[PDB]
């Protein structure tokens, strides 16, 4: 059951952060929208992007949500649920998404 | 859009995570 | 040296880095003190609401950094010696947001 | 439970001096061990410095008339604040907020 | 705000240099 704010491993293996809303996630829609999570922390200088410490994500290394790299994946491509991003850090993610998407 | 452009010069190499996005 | 805001200096607090948050009018004045936020290397502190992560590729610091907006110090202008680098205005806006958050401003 | 706008006495010997809590109440009511404050001086001439806020002794319950030095900000442990002097009125804390935003460029 | 602050402090156990060296430096300002 894919839910928003959750981090999954995706078949190239790279991590993704679910940004699709839970109504569309709990539906029979075969796709889920996500932002690509990189391990190049230098991308935290990008205005919209959000840094994610490994102690927070349960990921191997420190992470950065690249809000300019957004993907639509099939729900079957998501296998390993790593963990969930706190609502305070997901608010920063939402700010970046609305910034880059003009919403 | 200099703010975005300034950060791009900082990361001289592009991340392959963003490449997989196109894919 | 004319100390300016958004600049990172090494300061003896144990030499550790600090981020100047005092405004440039007060910096270019005859006031002997400057207010700054302590920069840590414990990147796990970037989860604290308001704190700002700083990649070393951006700060010119050795390791990745985190601005601890709950750790505010007042240093003498002479205590600031090593001008490491400057924080971009996009990341300083994140710092400004955090400071207003923790200080209710 | 330390709240904003409150005045506390703060610590070779010791040289205890008064401080005004400027850290926001959300951060104060949290498990954060530190609190941010502005140093309160008794040199009323420092009220001429831009941003500083004068505090009458009839308002603060302090011994002498006071001046909040918005250029002197310290981070103290929450345990170091024990003797609560008093609370600063909301009108003068607006002046403190005005001064703080001036020196911090906020 | 308070909830997320407490949660983050759970991961960062103990005290950090900044949360301490700031409490250290404070005495120098008040003395002058």
Give the key terms.
heteropentamer, A: 103 residues, alpha+beta, SH3 type barrels, six-stranded antiparallel beta sheet, globular, B: 23 residues, mainly alpha, 2 helices, 70% helix, elongated, Plasmid_toxin/cell-grow_inhib (chain A), Endoribonuclease MazF6 (chain A)
Give a verbal description of the structure:
The complex is a heteropentamer, with 3 copies of chain A and 2 copies of chain B. Chain A has 103 residues and is α+β, with helices and mostly antiparallel strands. Chain A has a single domain, classed as SH3 type barrels, CATH 2.30.30. Chain A is 22% helix and 39% strand. Chain A has helices spanning 22-25, 54-57, 87-101; strands at residues 6-10, 14-18, 31-38, 50-52, 63-74, 78-84. In chain A, strands 4-5-3-2-1-6 form a 6-stranded antiparallel sheet. Chain A is globular, with a radius of gyration of 13 Å. Chain B is mainly α and 23 residues long. Chain B contains 2 helices and no strands. Chain B is elongated, with a radius of gyration of 10 Å.
Beta content of chain B comes to: under 5%
The biggest sheet of chain A amounts to: 6 strands, antiparallel
Assign a percent range to the helix content of chain A. 10-25%
Q: Tally of extended strands of chain B?
A: 0
Q: Quaternary arrangement of the chains shown?
A: heteropentamer
Number of helices of chain A: 3
Order of helices and strands of chain A: EEHEEHEEH
User: How is the CATH topology of chain A named?
Assistant: SH3 type barrels
Order of helices and strands of chain B: HH
Radius of gyration of chain A: 13 Å
PDB class: toxin
Keywords: TA system, toxin
Assembly: pentameric
Entry title: Mtb. MazF-mt3 toxin in compleex with its antitoxin fragmant
């Amino acid at each position: 059951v894919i839910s928003r704010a959750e981090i999954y491993w995706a078949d190239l293996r790279r991590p993704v952060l679910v940004i699709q809303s839970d109504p569309y996630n709990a539906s029979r829609l075969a796709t889920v929208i996500a932002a690509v999570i990189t391990s190049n922390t230098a991308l935290a200088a990008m205005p919209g992007n959000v840094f994610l410490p490994a102690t927070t994500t349960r990921l191997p290394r420190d992470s950065v949500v690249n809000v300019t790299a957004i993907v639509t994946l099939n729900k079957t491509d998501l296998t390993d649920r790593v963990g969930e991003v706190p609502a305070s850090l997901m608010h920063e993610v939402d700010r970046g998404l609305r910034r880059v998407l003009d919403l | 859009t200099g703010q975005i452009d300034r950060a791009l010069e900082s990361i001289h190499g592009t991340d392959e995570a963003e490449a997989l996005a196109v894919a």
